[PDB]
Amino acid sequence: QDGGWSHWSPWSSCSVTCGDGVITRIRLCNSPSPQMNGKPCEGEARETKACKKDACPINGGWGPWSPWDICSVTCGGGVQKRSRLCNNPTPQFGGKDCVGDVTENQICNKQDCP
Numbered sequence: 001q002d003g004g005w006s007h008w009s010p011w012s013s014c015s016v017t018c019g020d021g022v023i024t025r026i027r028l029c030n031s032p033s034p035q036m037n038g039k040p041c042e043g044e045a046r047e048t049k050a051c052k053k054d055a056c057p058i059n060g061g062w063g064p065w066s067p068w069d070i071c072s073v074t075c076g077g078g079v080q081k082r083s084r085l086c087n088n089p090t091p092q093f094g095g096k097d098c099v100g101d102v103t104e105n106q107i108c109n110k111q112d113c114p
Ligand SMILES: *[C@@H]1O[C@@H](C)[C@@H](O)[C@@H](O)[C@@H]1O
Pocket: 016, 017, 018, 056, 057
């Protein structure tokens, strides 16, 4: 017998909770099922349409550490500092801040003086 399409399914929810997603619905060649000697169902069994929502949060990335500062002293124990920025990338769309220190300090030229 000739194939026959069911009614469509409901649309799924949007595939994604932010950014550009998709919604799907499906139909079966069962109304009736092409039993034998018969023409199939005409068209595709699935529609995918697009769904679009607000931009996905962009979490903070650490950019690269500054070259160390020059040591506070040429001998007998000093400090040097370096720094970094949360802008690789910058937190966007309620994305999370970077985790860890903006700064580092370390000893340098601990070698006893003449
Ligand atoms: C679903 O909810 C949205 C708001 C964001 O938190 C997404 O990362 C998540 O997939």
